[PDB]
Each structure stands twice: as structure tokens, then as C-alpha cells.
């Protein structure tokens, strides 16, 4: 049985992307400090321990699942699109996610808020005419007070409906005070939608929408994600495990149940 | 960095249509609103209206019937269009950026433009008539006699007063023009020793570029 | 919408702690109003100072502070310096409509009070030939930069045809100003004595003729 690792994860021959201090999801939404991972690509994406978000407090229900779908696709290729928001103020941002000189937010997201006196009943539609699936990512904002709710979106209680021809998610914000994070008792909630060719993404809302900036090109799940604090070395090795590289010469390995590449069976 | 510049006419006759342009840089019109603030000469500021990032606008109740703010998001230009102009409209027109803080929830006018002057006059370029001003009532008080020189009704600004073509410089005090009727009148005074006037000639020079006229007028006692 | 009112001008000296104020006809100035304090420097180059009532804008020195003092909003320069001389405008938000205040002229006494030199000039024979007469009173070299000009005819007070230029800084930083009394030759003949009364720092210094 193979029962020992070098201890390092060899940089060759699979394209290994070290996220350093960004997890995948943070690099995906576009946490200011993961701006470097933009449009990046990999076979194996290793998430370290350091990893800490550092932008608007958010929670992703169905995280581990959304995390895996992206990890598999192995590309982080974002494609901006021409969304048309008429009647609201775009580019919203905050101090909990500073960028440049001040207020910032997730690069891949667009915070809409009222335009002076009002927040119209938004209702855009964007058709997927292409020959590949689209993975839009959006969010809903939950102010922690009815004051905040009204300052930003006017309406006393918002709603976000993101429908395609086969689905229909209608989430409604939930006002209340959550634990303080980077000075905030507020939060955003990340949701997603994959649009199959010949389908139409339809965003209708009248409050709290945290609009998509475009879509993520999705290829076929050949790549994978893995958490490990293993160093990365310059060497050639085919079987990668959270513990490091282990040779695939023996038929059974007992090092770890998680591995990448032509590996010995786990025992 | 943020930056706003206004480019307009400068001079428009009553009953025409004023059209200023605020060209913003370093921020998007879909990200912020732009306000229009006008300052008539020797007055406070006046808020004209605002165009929100969402395109909707809000005008100053009063002037609303004549104002109209628009914008071309793709060009980074806001447009203040005023019709039925009347003299009172002579003022400095400014555009300032509308700012809103998402964390504390307050509005503010953070980036002000440089401004652009607009005079509403139906007057044709007319050279100034220049009347000399001498003491008259010789009280013989002290050694410093003070001569004057009225530069009456010219248009447009500016004129250039000078005494003895520059020889006199000490205390030439040249005041700002005023707007009597519809033209600019202005004055300038030089002070000299009684042992110089009428002994020597103290002459007044008034060149007025706009109307290529240049009058000299010797101030007699 | 409402009427924002504030001190015409205020005169301090370096060191002192001044406080401009901002009143609302419509009532007390709440946080709802987002009191904005713009600072207009020479030759109208406006600059944001405080926003949302007390949020100090970046460049603004720590010495400027925003606050609610009772039912009016305020700004307090703590330890004014000559470089604080300016017109300070207060702006109050009332439902997607801004309303500025009259502005306050802040003086920061940096030099000795100087008394104006007054001069009254009678109409010129020339100007009179064309049947118009204009009295020119040139007030100069005064400090601080503020005077009140009043015209008198035969002792009685004039209330027409007078126009006074706003004071203008000089090279020596003292001030100059000017006033004009415009009447028709006929009306200029109709009286005997004409006077220009320059009031500056309590006293009034007038010049007159006949
Ligand atoms: Zn492999
Ligand atoms: Zn002098
Ligand atoms: Zn009389």
C-alpha cells in the first residue's frame, strides 16, 4: 500500500492554482483581495487555511454545492453583459469592502439602490443565445432595520424573483440585526442560476436586488478543488492528495480519501 | 480623481435659450447624481435642480417651469437647458456631484465644478465714454490731491484704465465696474502731490479691447 | 421649500473659536436635513467642508466641526487662522430639494484697522452738457473690508440713483469701494449740497459738496 507523501504538492503536470488567502467563492464573487484570480483557470484549486473574506458580510446557502459546481468547471472566466437598469442608481458599495480610495464591493456584483425619490419595479430579461450554459450569480440584501430598508430601496419590504423558462426563485429580504462583521449587522445572500441554451434569465424585483454583472462561462467538470496547507514544489507528480504527492505505482493507497489524478485506490 | 467642468455660452440675449454642459470625469453618471447650483453676482447660491443616477430629476420649485436637466451617460455629460432667459439669470453656473453614503445614509454635494459665467444682455459692443474727474472744491487740506476718471457705459467687460500711460502707478485705485442701465460704468483714481497738479499733466487712458477704441482724456483743474 | 438663514458676516481674530449657525424657517434642523457646509474661497471656487451634519470631508482640517446646537445646525472653527477667511455656505435638504443659506462672510482680522479715505467728485462739465450728472464717491484703503455708504441731498436722505460696488481687496490687502449717485442735470441743479456718508467701524466719515 502507498502510505506516505513527500509533503508537497508538485506544480507539474496538472495546472495547480494556489488561492493563497482567497477561497474559491471569494475569488468568484470578487473580494477585492482576490482581484488577482480574475479569469484564472486550473485543474486543481488548493484552498489554504489563511483564507479570510474581507468585504460585505454575506452568507451562501447551498455553499458547498455552488462551491463544487464552480470548482469542477475549472475556469473562472467571467463575461460582462449589457444589463439595463433604468430608474435605479447602480454601482453601490461600502466601507466594509474598501477599494482604491474608499467604498467598494464585489467586482462581479452590482448593488442597485433607489434613484432619488424612488425604486421602480425592475424587470430585465437577458436571453442565452449562445451554445454553452451560463451560470449567473446574484444576491439579495437583508438590511438590519426598516430605516435602512427604506433609505436604500424605499419600499418597506423588497423582493427578488430570478426566473428562467424552467425555474423560479422568489426570495424576499428579511430585516433584522445579525452579528457585527466589519462594522455591519447587515448581510447579503448569494444565490445562483444556470441558464441552458435557448433560455432566458429574467430578473424582476422592486428591492434589495444585488444584480449580476454578467455570466460565468462553464466548461466540463474535469477539474477539482481541495483544501490543504501543503507546500507547492517544482516537481512532476500525478497523484495529488491533501497531504501531498504520492506515487501511483502501487494499486492501493491509504494516505487519504481525497486525491487528484491517476491515483491508487483508497484503503 | 473626480472632476467636473462647465462649458457654456458666456453671453446670451434675453429670450434665447441657455445651455450649459457639465462634463464629469472619474465617476460614472450611473453611479452618482449631478446637481446644478447658480450664483448671481453679489448674491447667495441657488440650487437649480438635480438629475439622479437613475435619470429621474428634481428641480427647484421656482425655476422648474423653465429648467430642464438631462444627460448623456455614454458621453459623461449633464445638460442644463434654460429657456425664456431674463437678465436676472446673469450668474455663475456650477455643477456639483451628488454623493450618498451607504453606511451612514446621508446626501452631500462633494465635487463642485469650476463654474462658468453667463451674462444675459441685449447690448451691442459699445465703447465707453470717458469723463475726467477733478476736485473742484479746493479745501487745500493736504499735499495729496486726488484725480478721477469716469468710464461710462461700455460693453462688454473689461476696460483698461491707466494714468499717464503707466508713469503714475502709486495709488492708481481702479474700482470694479457696476451695471447702471445695461452697460458697465467704472472709475479709477490716482493721487498726486499738489506740487504736481495742475503743474504737470495727469492723463487718463481707457483702452477698450472689445470695441477697439482707446480714449485718453487729460484731467484739467 | 423653507428658507435657510445664517449670519451675514462674522468677524473673528486668529485663535478665537467661532461658530457659524444654520437656521430653518420651517423648524428645527434635524439629522433629516443633512446640513451641508460648503466653503467659498476667493473668486468662487467652492469646496465641500462637512456633509450629513458632521462628517468632515477629507482635506478639511480637523479644526472644522459639524454639529447640532439646539434647533439649528452649526460649524465651529476652533482656532481660526487667516486662511479661514471665506464665505461659508450652509445647505439644508428638504425632500429631494436642496435649500442653501445666505452664506456668512468670515473675517479673520490679520492687520490693523484702517480708516477709509473718502472722496466725493462733482459731475464733469462734459457729462453735464449731455444732460446727465453722476456723483462719484471713491472710498479707499479701509480695513477691515466693510463699509456702508449713504447718500444725502441738501441734508435730506437719498434713496434713488445710488449704486455701491461691493468692497474689493487691494494689493496692500486693505480695501477699496465705490458709490455713484445718478441724476439728470435738471435734478442736479435742483439742490445745493450733496454728501456721501461712509460708515465704517461705528464712525461715519462723510465728504460733501455744492
Ligand atoms: Zn493527471
Ligand atoms: Zn491708496
Ligand atoms: Zn434741495
How do you describe this structure in short?
The complex is a heterotrimer of chains A (267), B (221) and C (210). Chain A is mainly β.
Describe it.
Chain A: It comes from Influenza A virus (strain A/Aichi/2/1968 H3N2). Chain A: Glycans are attached at residues 39, 123, 243. Chain A: Disulfide bonds join 10-235, 22-34, 55-97, 239-263. Chain A: This is Hemagglutinin HA1 chain. The complex is a heterotrimer of chains A (267), B (221) and C (210). Chain A is built from 3 helices and 23 strands. The longest helix of chain A is centred in the N-terminal third of the chain and has 11 residues, at 63-73. Chain A is mainly β. Chain A folds into 2 domains: 1-14 and 231-267, Hemagglutinin, Chain A, domain 2 (Ribbon), CATH 2.10.77; 15-230, Haemagglutinin, alpha/beta domain, HA1 chain (Hemagglutinin (Ha1 Chain), Chain: A, domain 1, Alpha-Beta Complex), CATH 3.90.209. Chain A has helices spanning 24-29, 63-73, 146-153, and strands spanning 9-12, 16-18, 44-47, 58-59, 78-80, 89-92, 94-99, 102-104, 109-113, 122-128, 134-142, 159-163, 169-171, 187-195, 199-207, 209-212, 214-217, 224-227, 232-236, 240-241, 244-245, 252-253, 265-266. In chain A, 9% of the residues lie in helices and 38% in strands. By secondary structure, chain B is an all-beta fold. Chain B has 2 domains: 1-123, Immunoglobulins (Immunoglobulin-like, Sandwich), CATH 2.60.40; 124-221, Immunoglobulins (Immunoglobulin-like, Sandwich), CATH 2.60.40.10. In chain B, the strands form 4 sheets. In chain B, strands 2, 4, 5, 6, 9, 10 and 11 form a 7-stranded mixed sheet that branches. In chain B, strands 12, 13, 15, 16 and 17 form a 5-stranded antiparallel sheet that branches. With 210 residues, chain C is mostly beta strands. Chain C has 2 domains: 1-110, Immunoglobulins (Immunoglobulin-like), CATH 2.60.40; 111-210, Immunoglobulin-like, CATH 2.60.40. Chain C contains 2 helices and 20 strands. In chain C, the strands form 4 sheets. In chain C, strands 2, 4, 5, 6, 9, 10 and 11 form a 7-stranded mixed sheet that branches. In chain C, strands 12, 13, 16, 17 and 18 form a 5-stranded antiparallel sheet that branches. In chain C, a hairpin with a 2-residue loop joins strand 19 and strand 20 (203-209). The longest helix of chain C has 5 residues, at 125-129. Chain C is elongated and about 60 Å long. In chain C, 40% of the residues are buried. The interface between B and C is large, with 46 and 49 residues. The structure holds zinc ion (ZN) (3 copies). The site of one zinc ion has 4 residues of chain A, from loops.
Amino acid at each position: 500500500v502507498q502510505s506516505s507523501s513527500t509533503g508537497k504538492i508538485c506544480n507539474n503536470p496538472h495546472r495547480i492554482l494556489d488561492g493563497i488567502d482567497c477561497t474559491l467563492i471569494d475569488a468568484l464573487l470578487g473580494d477585492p483581495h482576490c482581484d488577482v484570480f480574475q479569469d484564472e483557470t486550473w485543474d486543481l484549486f488548493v484552498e489554504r487555511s489563511k483564507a479570510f473574506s474581507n468585504c460585505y458580510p454575506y452568507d451562501v446557502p447551498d455553499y458547498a454545492s455552488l462551491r463544487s459546481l464552480v470548482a469542477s468547471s475549472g475556469t473562472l472566466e467571467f463575461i460582462t453583459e449589457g444589463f439595463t437598469w433604468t430608474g435605479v442608481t447602480q454601482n453601490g458599495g461600502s466601507n466594509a469592502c474598501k477599494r482604491g480610495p474608499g467604498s467598494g464591493f464585489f467586482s462581479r456584483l452590482n448593488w442597485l439602490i433607489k434613484s432619488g425619490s424612488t425604486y421602480p419595479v425592475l424587470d430585465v430579461t437577458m436571453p442565452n443565445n449562445d451554445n454553452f450554459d451560463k451560470l449567473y450569480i446574484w444576491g439579495i440584501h437583508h438590511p438590519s432595520t426598516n430605516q435602512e430598508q427604506t433609505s436604500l430601496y424605499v419600499q418597506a419590504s423588497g423582493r427578488v424573483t430570478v426566473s428562467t423558462r424552467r425555474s423560479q426563485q422568489t426570495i424576499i429580504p428579511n430585516i433584522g440585526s445579525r452579528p457585527w462583521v466589519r462594522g455591519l449587522s447587515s448581510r447579503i445572500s448569494i444565490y445562483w442560476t444556470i441558464v441552458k441554451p435557448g433560455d432566458v434569465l429574467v430578473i424582476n424585483s422592486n428591492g434589495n436586488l444585488i444584480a449580476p454583472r454578467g455570466y460565468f462561462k462553464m466548461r466540463t467538470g474535469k477539474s477539482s478543488i481541495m483544501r490543504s496547507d501543503a507546500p507547492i514544489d517544482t516537481c512532476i507528480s500525478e497523484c495529488i492528495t491533501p497531504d501531498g504527492s504520492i506515487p501511483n505505482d502501487k494499486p492501493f493507497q491509504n494516505v487519504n480519501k481525497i486525491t487528484y489524478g491517476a491515483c491508487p485506490k483508497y484503503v | 480623481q473626480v472632476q467636473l467642468k462647465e462649458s457654456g455660452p458666456g453671453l446670451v440675449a434675453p429670450s434665447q435659450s441657455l445651455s450649459i454642459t457639465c462634463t464629469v470625469s472619474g465617476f460614472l453618471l450611473i453611479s452618482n447624481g449631478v446637481h446644478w447650483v447658480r450664483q448671481p453676482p453679489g448674491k447667495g447660491l441657488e440650487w437649480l435642480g438635480v438629475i439622479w443616477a437613475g435619470g429621474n430629476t428634481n428641480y427647484n420649485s421656482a425655476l422648474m417651469s423653465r429648467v430642464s436637466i438631462s444627460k448623456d451617460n455614454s458621453k459623461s455629460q449633464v445638460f442644463l437647458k434654460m429657456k425664456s432667459l431674463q437678465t436676472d439669470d446673469t450668474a455663475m453656473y456650477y455643477c456639483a456631484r451628488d454623493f450618498y453614503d451607504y453606511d451612514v445614509f446621508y446626501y452631500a454635494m462633494d465635487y463642485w465644478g469650476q463654474g462658468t459665467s453667463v451674462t444675459v444682455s441685449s447690448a451691442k459692443t459699445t465703447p465707453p465714454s470717458v469723463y475726467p474727474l477733478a476736485p473742484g472744491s479746493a479745501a487745500q487740506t493736504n499735499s495729496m490731491v486726488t484725480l478721477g476718471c469716469l468710464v461710462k457705459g461700455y460693453f462688454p467687460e473689461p476696460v483698461t484704465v491707466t494714468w499717464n500711460s503707466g508713469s503714475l502707478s502709486s495709488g492708481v485705485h481702479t474700482f470694479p465696474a457696476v451695471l447702471q442701465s445695461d452697460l458697465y460704468t467704472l472709475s479709477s483714481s490716482v493721487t498726486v502731490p499738489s506740487s504736481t497738479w495742475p503743474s504737470e499733466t495727469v492723463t487718463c487712458n481707457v483702452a477698450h479691447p472689445a470695441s477697439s477704441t482707446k480714449v485718453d482724456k487729460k484731467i484739467v483743474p | 421649500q423653507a428658507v435657510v438663514t445664517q449670519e451675514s458676516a462674522l468677524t473673528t481674530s486668529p485663535g478665537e473659536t467661532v461658530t457659524l449657525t444654520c437656521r430653518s424657517s420651517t423648524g428645527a434642523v434635524t439629522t433629516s436635513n443633512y446640513a451641508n457646509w460648503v466653503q467659498e474661497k476667493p473668486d468662487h471656487l467652492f469646496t465641500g467642508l462637512i456633509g450629513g451634519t458632521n462628517n468632515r470631508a477629507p482635506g478639511v482640517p480637523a479644526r472644522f466641526s459639524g454639529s447640532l446646537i439646539g434647533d439649528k445646525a452649526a460649524l465651529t472653527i476652533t482656532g481660526a487662522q487667516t486662511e479661514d477667511e471665506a464665505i461659508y455656505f450652509c445647505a439644508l435638504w428638504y425632500s429631494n430639494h436642496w435649500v442653501f443659506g445666505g452664506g456668512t462672510k468670515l473675517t479673520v482680522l490679520g492687520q490693523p484697522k484702517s480708516s477709509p479715505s473718502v472722496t466725493l467728485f462733482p459731475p464733469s462739465s462734459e457729462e453735464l452738457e449731455t444732460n446727465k450728472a453722476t456723483l462719484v464717491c471713491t472710498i479707499t484703503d479701509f480695513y477691515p473690508g466693510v463699509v456702508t455708504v449713504d447718500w444725502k441731498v441738501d441734508g435730506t436722505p437719498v434713496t434713488q440713483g445710488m449704486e455701491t460696488t461691493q468692497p474689493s481687496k487691494q494689493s496692500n490687502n486693505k480695501y477699496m469701494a465705490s458709490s455713484y449717485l445718478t441724476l439728470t442735470a435738471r435734478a442736479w441743479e435742483r439742490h445745493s449740497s450733496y454728501s456721501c456718508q461712509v460708515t465704517h467701524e461705528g464712525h461715519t466719515v462723510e465728504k460733501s459738496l455744492s
